[PDB]
């Protein structure tokens, strides 16, 4: 039922309704001779939408906004990027040009600038220390500590018990580490345990790439990170 | 013009005619949350066909044979696997059940057995030393030395100037190393130079995965291997 790369040509975006007023958005990107999917989140906040992460690039993100406009028909007023990599901020300029207020932590904004990536305009304060949580409309933003990146955030939708782990959480089908160039392998398991301890009631867990599941995805990611550590 | 993973659902196989009586076969496989393509070769020999490498698995290889039967309509009498990994021998049992004589070097047969992979039935003698070449019907088989694997073979079709590099040769779009668990990074550039020196007249170069090109694919692979070596 969840869309895979098969049903998504490169450049198209699919939406998947997880619960009342909660969708994921799925896009694909081709690099290094393979094709990868990527997830973000959409959360209804009254008569508007909060977007979590771009669709991995300007063209994808323009298709994302067109797909939201036709399938949901509510305005995207704010967006949050969960870390500084292109699958999360690639397309921020498209969002800004459409009138979306783009947000990220100062850590993410700093790292995006150093990398030469697109930089969300607004700063999310209160997330600099591991275990920090802040409310952002219909979601909670949580900094679990360094993992996939030193800045990665996770997002929880309390009304639907949906946990969006971003790239700090792997799908079950991924049994080897992904891009860990910017990761903190030493701290990643501890950061996942902070997620587990803060959101033990989560019923739906969305990885940054691939199929959703339950809280088992946290233990799965810990297994994979530790195996990579011991390579 | 060359098929990519977009036009190939996982489980289907496409044929691409390179020249008179020379085709590549293209399949896809899901692996670790991504989709990868894979190439093999088909070379007409009189009224029969020589197959280079499986389509990466039993289902793909059954689809490969059905696609050959309907699009070319000539019998596959012999097959050669160019190294011992599953994208080259996965499906050998299907070929054997269909009456195809399967071949590999004793080095490949030895390594496949150790790995628990399918084992081609017939042995290709005369390929144990770097630089060894043997004729096999309408092609020449060449052992350039260890590279992607210690056993990898390349195949040249002299009548069409087609060089099938297998997984020792990367497509241009791949700028980072692939699966190098069984590779000899120290010897891979020297092995590529042997290919260059033996087939300087090659006009079309087929990598194990992705888009074909010219002999520049050899220098490209050297560039990528050396960069990975210096990681
Ligand atoms: O490299 C980046 C951001 S780094 C990153 N974060 N997450 C991942 C990632 C990707 C696939 C599967 C798993 C993961 C993961 O482990 O999360 N990669 N973007 C980028 N570079 C490009 C170069 C050329 C063309 C397009 C490009 N798009
Ligand atoms: O390990 C193998 C065969 S080794 C091999 N040879 N060539 C390649 C290859 C594949 C794609 C792109 C480039 C290359 C390359 O670099 O040539 N891979 N298959 C395998 N392992 C798995 C482990 C877990 C789940 C599924 C798995 N499927
Ligand atoms: Cl590839
Ligand atoms: Cl931590
Ligand atoms: Cl992936
Ligand atoms: Cl060598
Ligand atoms: Mg490739
Ligand atoms: Mg994945
Ligand atoms: Na490509
Ligand atoms: Na809102
Ligand atoms: Na023949
Ligand atoms: Na060139
Ligand atoms: Zn990332
Ligand atoms: Zn990612
Ligand atoms: Zn291989
Ligand atoms: Zn391969």
Author numbering:
A (entry chain B), B (entry chain A): 30 to 45, 47 to 64, 66 to 100, 102 to 107, 109 to 131, 133 to 150, 165 to 205, 209 to 211, ...
Source paper text:
A main mechanism for bacteria to develop resistance to β-lactams is the expression of β-lactamase, which hydrolyze the β-lactam ring and renders the antibiotics ineffective. Based on amino acid sequence homology and Zn(II) content, MβLs are further divided into subclasses B1, B2, and B3. VIM-2, a B1 subclass MβL, was initially discovered in P. aeruginosa, which showed a high prelevance and broad substrate spectrum, including penicillins, cephalosporins, and carbapenems, it therefore reflects a significant drug target for the treatment of antibiotic-resistant bacterial infection. As is typical for B1 MβLs, there are two Zn(II) ions in the active sites of the enzyme.
However, only the crystal structure of VIM-2 in complex with 1b (VIM-2:1b) was obtained successfully through co-crystallization. The protein active site structure, including Zn–ligand and the distances between the two Zn ions (3.9 Å) agreed with the publications. The crystallographic analysis revealed that 1b replaced the hydroxide which bridges the two Zn(II) ions and bound to the Zn(II) ions via N atoms on the triazole ring; the carboxyl moiety of 1b interacted with Zn2 and formed an H-bond with the backbone N atom of Asn233 and the water molecule W2. Importantly, we found that the phenyl at R1 position formed π-π stacking with the imidazole ring of His263, the favorable hydrophobic interaction reasonably explained the SAR that the aromatic carboxyl substituted 2-triazolylthioactamides (1a–j) exhibited a better inhibitory activity against VIM-2 than the aliphatic carboxyl substituted compounds (2a–e and 3a–e). In our crystal structure, residues Trp87 kept a native pose, yet the binding of 1b to the active sites of VIM-2 resulted in a conformational change of the residue Phe61 on the L3 loop and formed a potential clash with Phe61 utilizing the benzimidazole group. Moreover, two Cl− and four Na+ ions have been observed. IC50 values of 1a–j against VIM-2 were measured in 30 mM Tris, pH 7.6, in which the concentrations of inhibitors were varied between 0 and 120 µM. The IC50 data listed in Table 1 indicated that the 2-triazolylthioactamides 1a–j inhibited VIM-2 with an IC50 value in the range 20.6–58.6 μM, and 1h was the most potent inhibitor (IC50 = 20.6 μM).
